[PDB]
Amino acid sequence: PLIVPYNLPLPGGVVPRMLITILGTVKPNANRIALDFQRGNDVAFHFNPRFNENNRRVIVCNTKLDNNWGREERQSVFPFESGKPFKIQVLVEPDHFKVAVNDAHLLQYNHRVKKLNEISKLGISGDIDLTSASYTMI
Ligand SMILES: OC[C@H]1O[C@@H](O[C@H]2[C@H](O)[C@@H](O)[C@H](O)O[C@@H]2CO)[C@H](O)[C@@H](O)[C@H]1O
């Protein structure tokens, strides 16, 4: 496997038609997963499944600028399950990140950080065994 937290460099940043594919398995009794698309210290797109927030499962998405979190976008559709293998696909489209899990569309996140080619790293963290993380141009 890959060691978590795992960094995936995105050479030259992201660009529309770039597809990121993450395969892993959720640990037993998981609490959280996070994807952090970084522009230096800023987080352009934070994607954060939470398995127990006040006894609810929710995906929280946000942007961090100068160490400040912005407005959360929350999604109560929650395709992850403790103990089970998953696939996350993040497709960069011109105006949003488009996320599908296990081949089903999940959410979109409008670009707040505009300098896409400066979003040069993806951090993958949380309560998972990470099997693979890669990108391709489609
Ligand atoms: O917004 C993403 C960001 O959330 C932090 O937790 C928030 C929490 O979601 C919010 O309900 C509460 O009022 O403030 C917390 C701190 O901003 C996480 O700590 C952080 O990791 C991100 O997930």
Side-chain angles (χ1 to χ4, degrees), residues 17-47:
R17 297 183 70 151
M18 187 168 185
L19 178 67
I20 297 94
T21 301
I22 300 166
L23 291 165
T25 298
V26 182
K27 291 178 175 185
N29 308 119
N31 181 72
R32 71 187 295 273
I33 302 167
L35 306 186
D36 289 282
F37 288 87
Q38 308 266 353
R39 172 175 177 258
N41 188 62
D42 285 355
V43 183
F45 176 39
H46 174 78
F47 171 93

PDB file of all heavy atoms in Angstrom, residues 17-47:
ATOM      1  N   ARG A  17      -9.981  18.642 -17.377  1.00  0.00           N
ATOM      2  CA  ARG A  17      -9.821  17.301 -17.972  1.00  0.00           C
ATOM      3  C   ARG A  17      -8.776  16.466 -17.235  1.00  0.00           C
ATOM      4  O   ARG A  17      -8.472  15.348 -17.646  1.00  0.00           O
ATOM      5  CB  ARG A  17      -9.496  17.395 -19.469  1.00  0.00           C
ATOM      6  CG  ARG A  17     -10.623  18.044 -20.264  1.00  0.00           C
ATOM      7  CD  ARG A  17     -10.369  18.079 -21.765  1.00  0.00           C
ATOM      8  NE  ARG A  17     -10.438  16.758 -22.381  1.00  0.00           N
ATOM      9  CZ  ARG A  17     -10.804  16.541 -23.643  1.00  0.00           C
ATOM     10  NH1 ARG A  17     -11.149  17.559 -24.422  1.00  0.00           N
ATOM     11  NH2 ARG A  17     -10.831  15.307 -24.124  1.00  0.00           N
ATOM     12  N   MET A  18      -8.269  16.973 -16.116  1.00  0.00           N
ATOM     13  CA  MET A  18      -7.454  16.152 -15.242  1.00  0.00           C
ATOM     14  C   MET A  18      -8.341  15.352 -14.284  1.00  0.00           C
ATOM     15  O   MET A  18      -9.172  15.907 -13.557  1.00  0.00           O
ATOM     16  CB  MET A  18      -6.467  17.015 -14.473  1.00  0.00           C
ATOM     17  CG  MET A  18      -5.458  16.250 -13.666  1.00  0.00           C
ATOM     18  SD  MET A  18      -4.204  17.418 -13.138  1.00  0.00           S
ATOM     19  CE  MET A  18      -3.057  16.304 -12.338  1.00  0.00           C
ATOM     20  N   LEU A  19      -8.144  14.039 -14.297  1.00  0.00           N
ATOM     21  CA  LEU A  19      -8.907  13.099 -13.478  1.00  0.00           C
ATOM     22  C   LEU A  19      -8.008  12.462 -12.432  1.00  0.00           C
ATOM     23  O   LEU A  19      -7.020  11.801 -12.782  1.00  0.00           O
ATOM     24  CB  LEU A  19      -9.533  12.014 -14.358  1.00  0.00           C
ATOM     25  CG  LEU A  19     -10.322  10.929 -13.620  1.00  0.00           C
ATOM     26  CD1 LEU A  19     -11.570  11.519 -12.989  1.00  0.00           C
ATOM     27  CD2 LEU A  19     -10.685   9.785 -14.551  1.00  0.00           C
ATOM     28  N   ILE A  20      -8.339  12.662 -11.159  1.00  0.00           N
ATOM     29  CA  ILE A  20      -7.611  12.050 -10.068  1.00  0.00           C
ATOM     30  C   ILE A  20      -8.415  10.848  -9.557  1.00  0.00           C
ATOM     31  O   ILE A  20      -9.623  10.970  -9.281  1.00  0.00           O
ATOM     32  CB  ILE A  20      -7.358  13.051  -8.934  1.00  0.00           C
ATOM     33  CG1 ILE A  20      -6.481  14.209  -9.419  1.00  0.00           C
ATOM     34  CG2 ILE A  20      -6.707  12.358  -7.757  1.00  0.00           C
ATOM     35  CD1 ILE A  20      -7.261  15.429  -9.900  1.00  0.00           C
ATOM     36  N   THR A  21      -7.756   9.695  -9.453  1.00  0.00           N
ATOM     37  CA  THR A  21      -8.404   8.472  -8.978  1.00  0.00           C
ATOM     38  C   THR A  21      -7.701   7.951  -7.736  1.00  0.00           C
ATOM     39  O   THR A  21      -6.478   7.727  -7.743  1.00  0.00           O
ATOM     40  CB  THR A  21      -8.403   7.385 -10.060  1.00  0.00           C
ATOM     41  OG1 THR A  21      -9.101   7.877 -11.206  1.00  0.00           O
ATOM     42  CG2 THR A  21      -9.086   6.105  -9.562  1.00  0.00           C
ATOM     43  N   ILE A  22      -8.481   7.767  -6.672  1.00  0.00           N
ATOM     44  CA  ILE A  22      -7.993   7.272  -5.400  1.00  0.00           C
ATOM     45  C   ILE A  22      -8.706   5.978  -5.052  1.00  0.00           C
ATOM     46  O   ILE A  22      -9.937   5.927  -5.037  1.00  0.00           O
ATOM     47  CB  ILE A  22      -8.203   8.303  -4.303  1.00  0.00           C
ATOM     48  CG1 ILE A  22      -7.441   9.573  -4.668  1.00  0.00           C
ATOM     49  CG2 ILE A  22      -7.772   7.753  -2.949  1.00  0.00           C
ATOM     50  CD1 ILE A  22      -7.825  10.735  -3.867  1.00  0.00           C
ATOM     51  N   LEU A  23      -7.937   4.920  -4.828  1.00  0.00           N
ATOM     52  CA  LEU A  23      -8.477   3.648  -4.354  1.00  0.00           C
ATOM     53  C   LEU A  23      -7.983   3.381  -2.952  1.00  0.00           C
ATOM     54  O   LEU A  23      -6.785   3.525  -2.670  1.00  0.00           O
ATOM     55  CB  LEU A  23      -8.055   2.496  -5.266  1.00  0.00           C
ATOM     56  CG  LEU A  23      -8.644   2.455  -6.674  1.00  0.00           C
ATOM     57  CD1 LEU A  23      -7.873   1.487  -7.569  1.00  0.00           C
ATOM     58  CD2 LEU A  23     -10.103   2.067  -6.596  1.00  0.00           C
ATOM     59  N   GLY A  24      -8.884   2.992  -2.062  1.00  0.00           N
ATOM     60  CA  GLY A  24      -8.477   2.612  -0.726  1.00  0.00           C
ATOM     61  C   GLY A  24      -9.583   1.852  -0.038  1.00  0.00           C
ATOM     62  O   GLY A  24     -10.624   1.574  -0.637  1.00  0.00           O
ATOM     63  N   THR A  25      -9.347   1.505   1.219  1.00  0.00           N
ATOM     64  CA  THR A  25     -10.331   0.810   2.024  1.00  0.00           C
ATOM     65  C   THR A  25     -10.467   1.533   3.346  1.00  0.00           C
ATOM     66  O   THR A  25      -9.473   1.895   3.970  1.00  0.00           O
ATOM     67  CB  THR A  25      -9.926  -0.656   2.239  1.00  0.00           C
ATOM     68  OG1 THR A  25      -9.860  -1.311   0.967  1.00  0.00           O
ATOM     69  CG2 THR A  25     -10.933  -1.381   3.113  1.00  0.00           C
ATOM     70  N   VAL A  26     -11.696   1.791   3.765  1.00  0.00           N
ATOM     71  CA  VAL A  26     -11.919   2.483   5.025  1.00  0.00           C
ATOM     72  C   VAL A  26     -11.581   1.548   6.176  1.00  0.00           C
ATOM     73  O   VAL A  26     -11.959   0.374   6.156  1.00  0.00           O
ATOM     74  CB  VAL A  26     -13.375   2.972   5.142  1.00  0.00           C
ATOM     75  CG1 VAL A  26     -13.590   3.727   6.433  1.00  0.00           C
ATOM     76  CG2 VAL A  26     -13.725   3.854   3.953  1.00  0.00           C
ATOM     77  N   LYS A  27     -10.861   2.055   7.169  1.00  0.00           N
ATOM     78  CA  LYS A  27     -10.562   1.274   8.367  1.00  0.00           C
ATOM     79  C   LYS A  27     -11.824   0.960   9.175  1.00  0.00           C
ATOM     80  O   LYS A  27     -12.845   1.632   9.039  1.00  0.00           O
ATOM     81  CB  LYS A  27      -9.563   2.026   9.245  1.00  0.00           C
ATOM     82  CG  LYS A  27      -8.165   2.123   8.659  1.00  0.00           C
ATOM     83  CD  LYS A  27      -7.263   2.930   9.578  1.00  0.00           C
ATOM     84  CE  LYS A  27      -5.828   2.959   9.083  1.00  0.00           C
ATOM     85  NZ  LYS A  27      -4.932   3.654  10.052  1.00  0.00           N
ATOM     86  N   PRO A  28     -11.758  -0.075  10.031  1.00  0.00           N
ATOM     87  CA  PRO A  28     -12.863  -0.310  10.965  1.00  0.00           C
ATOM     88  C   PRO A  28     -13.049   0.895  11.881  1.00  0.00           C
ATOM     89  O   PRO A  28     -12.064   1.536  12.237  1.00  0.00           O
ATOM     90  CB  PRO A  28     -12.402  -1.537  11.765  1.00  0.00           C
ATOM     91  CG  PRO A  28     -11.401  -2.206  10.894  1.00  0.00           C
ATOM     92  CD  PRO A  28     -10.701  -1.093  10.167  1.00  0.00           C
ATOM     93  N   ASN A  29     -14.290   1.201  12.238  1.00  0.00           N
ATOM     94  CA  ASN A  29     -14.576   2.282  13.182  1.00  0.00           C
ATOM     95  C   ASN A  29     -13.937   3.609  12.777  1.00  0.00           C
ATOM     96  O   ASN A  29     -13.412   4.349  13.612  1.00  0.00           O
ATOM     97  CB  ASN A  29     -14.107   1.896  14.591  1.00  0.00           C
ATOM     98  CG  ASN A  29     -14.640   0.548  15.037  1.00  0.00           C
ATOM     99  OD1 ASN A  29     -13.873  -0.376  15.318  1.00  0.00           O
ATOM    100  ND2 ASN A  29     -15.959   0.427  15.102  1.00  0.00           N
ATOM    101  N   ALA A  30     -13.968   3.904  11.483  1.00  0.00           N
ATOM    102  CA  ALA A  30     -13.343   5.118  10.984  1.00  0.00           C
ATOM    103  C   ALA A  30     -14.036   6.348  11.528  1.00  0.00           C
ATOM    104  O   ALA A  30     -15.233   6.340  11.803  1.00  0.00           O
ATOM    105  CB  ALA A  30     -13.362   5.142   9.489  1.00  0.00           C
ATOM    106  N   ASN A  31     -13.262   7.413  11.678  1.00  0.00           N
ATOM    107  CA  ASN A  31     -13.805   8.698  12.077  1.00  0.00           C
ATOM    108  C   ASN A  31     -13.828   9.714  10.939  1.00  0.00           C
ATOM    109  O   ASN A  31     -14.776  10.492  10.830  1.00  0.00           O
ATOM    110  CB  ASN A  31     -13.022   9.264  13.259  1.00  0.00           C
ATOM    111  CG  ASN A  31     -13.575  10.589  13.734  1.00  0.00           C
ATOM    112  OD1 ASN A  31     -14.650  10.648  14.330  1.00  0.00           O
ATOM    113  ND2 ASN A  31     -12.843  11.665  13.471  1.00  0.00           N
ATOM    114  N   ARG A  32     -12.791   9.717  10.102  1.00  0.00           N
ATOM    115  CA  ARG A  32     -12.673  10.740   9.066  1.00  0.00           C
ATOM    116  C   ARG A  32     -11.805  10.303   7.901  1.00  0.00           C
ATOM    117  O   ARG A  32     -10.971   9.399   8.032  1.00  0.00           O
ATOM    118  CB  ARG A  32     -12.101  12.031   9.650  1.00  0.00           C
ATOM    119  CG  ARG A  32     -10.626  11.921  10.012  1.00  0.00           C
ATOM    120  CD  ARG A  32     -10.129  13.166  10.750  1.00  0.00           C
ATOM    121  NE  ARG A  32     -10.151  14.380   9.929  1.00  0.00           N
ATOM    122  CZ  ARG A  32      -9.162  14.768   9.125  1.00  0.00           C
ATOM    123  NH1 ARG A  32      -8.061  14.040   9.017  1.00  0.00           N
ATOM    124  NH2 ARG A  32      -9.270  15.890   8.423  1.00  0.00           N
ATOM    125  N   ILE A  33     -12.027  10.959   6.767  1.00  0.00           N
ATOM    126  CA  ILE A  33     -11.171  10.895   5.595  1.00  0.00           C
ATOM    127  C   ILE A  33     -10.962  12.340   5.165  1.00  0.00           C
ATOM    128  O   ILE A  33     -11.862  13.160   5.345  1.00  0.00           O
ATOM    129  CB  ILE A  33     -11.819  10.092   4.451  1.00  0.00           C
ATOM    130  CG1 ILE A  33     -12.151   8.666   4.896  1.00  0.00           C
ATOM    131  CG2 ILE A  33     -10.921  10.058   3.222  1.00  0.00           C
ATOM    132  CD1 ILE A  33     -13.066   7.939   3.931  1.00  0.00           C
ATOM    133  N   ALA A  34      -9.811  12.667   4.586  1.00  0.00           N
ATOM    134  CA  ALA A  34      -9.654  13.994   3.991  1.00  0.00           C
ATOM    135  C   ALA A  34      -8.808  13.975   2.735  1.00  0.00           C
ATOM    136  O   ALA A  34      -7.740  13.334   2.687  1.00  0.00           O
ATOM    137  CB  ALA A  34      -9.049  14.959   4.984  1.00  0.00           C
ATOM    138  N   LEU A  35      -9.285  14.701   1.731  1.00  0.00           N
ATOM    139  CA  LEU A  35      -8.489  15.106   0.577  1.00  0.00           C
ATOM    140  C   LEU A  35      -8.253  16.600   0.672  1.00  0.00           C
ATOM    141  O   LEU A  35      -9.200  17.368   0.901  1.00  0.00           O
ATOM    142  CB  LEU A  35      -9.205  14.804  -0.737  1.00  0.00           C
ATOM    143  CG  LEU A  35      -9.692  13.377  -0.988  1.00  0.00           C
ATOM    144  CD1 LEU A  35     -10.244  13.239  -2.407  1.00  0.00           C
ATOM    145  CD2 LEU A  35      -8.603  12.364  -0.730  1.00  0.00           C
ATOM    146  N   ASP A  36      -7.004  17.018   0.500  1.00  0.00           N
ATOM    147  CA  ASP A  36      -6.637  18.420   0.553  1.00  0.00           C
ATOM    148  C   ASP A  36      -5.853  18.794  -0.696  1.00  0.00           C
ATOM    149  O   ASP A  36      -4.667  18.478  -0.818  1.00  0.00           O
ATOM    150  CB  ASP A  36      -5.812  18.716   1.803  1.00  0.00           C
ATOM    151  CG  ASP A  36      -6.635  18.661   3.069  1.00  0.00           C
ATOM    152  OD1 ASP A  36      -7.360  19.639   3.328  1.00  0.00           O
ATOM    153  OD2 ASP A  36      -6.558  17.666   3.826  1.00  0.00           O
ATOM    154  N   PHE A  37      -6.513  19.458  -1.628  1.00  0.00           N
ATOM    155  CA  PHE A  37      -5.844  20.006  -2.802  1.00  0.00           C
ATOM    156  C   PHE A  37      -5.237  21.330  -2.391  1.00  0.00           C
ATOM    157  O   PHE A  37      -5.968  22.273  -2.067  1.00  0.00           O
ATOM    158  CB  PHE A  37      -6.823  20.212  -3.952  1.00  0.00           C
ATOM    159  CG  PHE A  37      -7.294  18.936  -4.599  1.00  0.00           C
ATOM    160  CD1 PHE A  37      -8.397  18.243  -4.104  1.00  0.00           C
ATOM    161  CD2 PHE A  37      -6.640  18.437  -5.722  1.00  0.00           C
ATOM    162  CE1 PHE A  37      -8.828  17.067  -4.721  1.00  0.00           C
ATOM    163  CE2 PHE A  37      -7.067  17.279  -6.338  1.00  0.00           C
ATOM    164  CZ  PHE A  37      -8.156  16.590  -5.840  1.00  0.00           C
ATOM    165  N   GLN A  38      -3.906  21.395  -2.389  1.00  0.00           N
ATOM    166  CA  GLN A  38      -3.153  22.522  -1.843  1.00  0.00           C
ATOM    167  C   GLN A  38      -2.628  23.485  -2.896  1.00  0.00           C
ATOM    168  O   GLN A  38      -2.190  23.080  -3.967  1.00  0.00           O
ATOM    169  CB  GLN A  38      -1.951  22.021  -1.028  1.00  0.00           C
ATOM    170  CG  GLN A  38      -2.269  20.996   0.037  1.00  0.00           C
ATOM    171  CD  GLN A  38      -2.494  21.600   1.414  1.00  0.00           C
ATOM    172  OE1 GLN A  38      -2.289  22.799   1.643  1.00  0.00           O
ATOM    173  NE2 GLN A  38      -2.931  20.760   2.344  1.00  0.00           N
ATOM    174  N   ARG A  39      -2.661  24.767  -2.552  1.00  0.00           N
ATOM    175  CA  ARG A  39      -1.908  25.803  -3.246  1.00  0.00           C
ATOM    176  C   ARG A  39      -0.974  26.416  -2.190  1.00  0.00           C
ATOM    177  O   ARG A  39      -1.375  27.292  -1.429  1.00  0.00           O
ATOM    178  CB  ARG A  39      -2.843  26.856  -3.843  1.00  0.00           C
ATOM    179  CG  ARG A  39      -2.123  28.076  -4.416  1.00  0.00           C
ATOM    180  CD  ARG A  39      -3.070  29.053  -5.125  1.00  0.00           C
ATOM    181  NE  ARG A  39      -2.314  30.224  -5.572  1.00  0.00           N
ATOM    182  CZ  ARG A  39      -2.312  31.404  -4.964  1.00  0.00           C
ATOM    183  NH1 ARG A  39      -3.071  31.627  -3.907  1.00  0.00           N
ATOM    184  NH2 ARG A  39      -1.543  32.378  -5.432  1.00  0.00           N
ATOM    185  N   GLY A  40       0.250  25.902  -2.096  1.00  0.00           N
ATOM    186  CA  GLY A  40       1.120  26.244  -0.979  1.00  0.00           C
ATOM    187  C   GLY A  40       0.434  25.889   0.331  1.00  0.00           C
ATOM    188  O   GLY A  40      -0.081  24.785   0.486  1.00  0.00           O
ATOM    189  N   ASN A  41       0.409  26.830   1.266  1.00  0.00           N
ATOM    190  CA  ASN A  41      -0.277  26.639   2.536  1.00  0.00           C
ATOM    191  C   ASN A  41      -1.796  26.722   2.436  1.00  0.00           C
ATOM    192  O   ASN A  41      -2.496  26.341   3.374  1.00  0.00           O
ATOM    193  CB  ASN A  41       0.204  27.674   3.558  1.00  0.00           C
ATOM    194  CG  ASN A  41      -0.334  27.411   4.957  1.00  0.00           C
ATOM    195  OD1 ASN A  41      -0.057  26.366   5.554  1.00  0.00           O
ATOM    196  ND2 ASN A  41      -1.096  28.355   5.488  1.00  0.00           N
ATOM    197  N   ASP A  42      -2.320  27.252   1.336  1.00  0.00           N
ATOM    198  CA  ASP A  42      -3.768  27.303   1.186  1.00  0.00           C
ATOM    199  C   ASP A  42      -4.315  25.946   0.758  1.00  0.00           C
ATOM    200  O   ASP A  42      -3.633  25.154   0.091  1.00  0.00           O
ATOM    201  CB  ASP A  42      -4.185  28.374   0.179  1.00  0.00           C
ATOM    202  CG  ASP A  42      -4.075  29.782   0.735  1.00  0.00           C
ATOM    203  OD1 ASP A  42      -3.773  29.963   1.936  1.00  0.00           O
ATOM    204  OD2 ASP A  42      -4.305  30.710  -0.058  1.00  0.00           O
ATOM    205  N   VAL A  43      -5.559  25.678   1.143  1.00  0.00           N
ATOM    206  CA  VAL A  43      -6.267  24.500   0.672  1.00  0.00           C
ATOM    207  C   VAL A  43      -7.361  24.950  -0.285  1.00  0.00           C
ATOM    208  O   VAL A  43      -8.370  25.533   0.135  1.00  0.00           O
ATOM    209  CB  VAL A  43      -6.862  23.674   1.830  1.00  0.00           C
ATOM    210  CG1 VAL A  43      -7.519  22.419   1.270  1.00  0.00           C
ATOM    211  CG2 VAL A  43      -5.776  23.288   2.821  1.00  0.00           C
ATOM    212  N   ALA A  44      -7.137  24.720  -1.572  1.00  0.00           N
ATOM    213  CA  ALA A  44      -8.108  25.096  -2.583  1.00  0.00           C
ATOM    214  C   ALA A  44      -9.416  24.323  -2.439  1.00  0.00           C
ATOM    215  O   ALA A  44     -10.500  24.879  -2.631  1.00  0.00           O
ATOM    216  CB  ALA A  44      -7.526  24.876  -3.971  1.00  0.00           C
ATOM    217  N   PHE A  45      -9.305  23.029  -2.157  1.00  0.00           N
ATOM    218  CA  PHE A  45     -10.461  22.146  -2.058  1.00  0.00           C
ATOM    219  C   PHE A  45     -10.153  21.079  -1.023  1.00  0.00           C
ATOM    220  O   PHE A  45      -9.249  20.246  -1.209  1.00  0.00           O
ATOM    221  CB  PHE A  45     -10.775  21.531  -3.430  1.00  0.00           C
ATOM    222  CG  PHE A  45     -11.895  20.510  -3.436  1.00  0.00           C
ATOM    223  CD1 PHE A  45     -13.045  20.675  -2.668  1.00  0.00           C
ATOM    224  CD2 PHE A  45     -11.809  19.404  -4.263  1.00  0.00           C
ATOM    225  CE1 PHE A  45     -14.067  19.720  -2.703  1.00  0.00           C
ATOM    226  CE2 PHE A  45     -12.823  18.459  -4.309  1.00  0.00           C
ATOM    227  CZ  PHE A  45     -13.955  18.614  -3.536  1.00  0.00           C
ATOM    228  N   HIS A  46     -10.897  21.150   0.076  1.00  0.00           N
ATOM    229  CA  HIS A  46     -10.877  20.218   1.190  1.00  0.00           C
ATOM    230  C   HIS A  46     -12.151  19.386   1.091  1.00  0.00           C
ATOM    231  O   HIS A  46     -13.244  19.954   1.035  1.00  0.00           O
ATOM    232  CB  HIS A  46     -10.836  21.022   2.488  1.00  0.00           C
ATOM    233  CG  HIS A  46     -10.954  20.233   3.758  1.00  0.00           C
ATOM    234  ND1 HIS A  46      -9.907  19.523   4.304  1.00  0.00           N
ATOM    235  CD2 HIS A  46     -11.965  20.154   4.656  1.00  0.00           C
ATOM    236  CE1 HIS A  46     -10.283  19.007   5.464  1.00  0.00           C
ATOM    237  NE2 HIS A  46     -11.529  19.376   5.700  1.00  0.00           N
ATOM    238  N   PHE A  47     -12.018  18.063   1.048  1.00  0.00           N
ATOM    239  CA  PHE A  47     -13.124  17.114   0.916  1.00  0.00           C
ATOM    240  C   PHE A  47     -13.012  16.182   2.110  1.00  0.00           C
ATOM    241  O   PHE A  47     -12.030  15.446   2.219  1.00  0.00           O
ATOM    242  CB  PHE A  47     -13.003  16.375  -0.420  1.00  0.00           C
ATOM    243  CG  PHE A  47     -13.958  15.202  -0.606  1.00  0.00           C
ATOM    244  CD1 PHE A  47     -15.194  15.377  -1.226  1.00  0.00           C
ATOM    245  CD2 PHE A  47     -13.583  13.916  -0.225  1.00  0.00           C
ATOM    246  CE1 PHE A  47     -16.046  14.300  -1.433  1.00  0.00           C
ATOM    247  CE2 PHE A  47     -14.434  12.843  -0.423  1.00  0.00           C
ATOM    248  CZ  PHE A  47     -15.665  13.035  -1.031  1.00  0.00           C
TER     249      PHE A  47
END
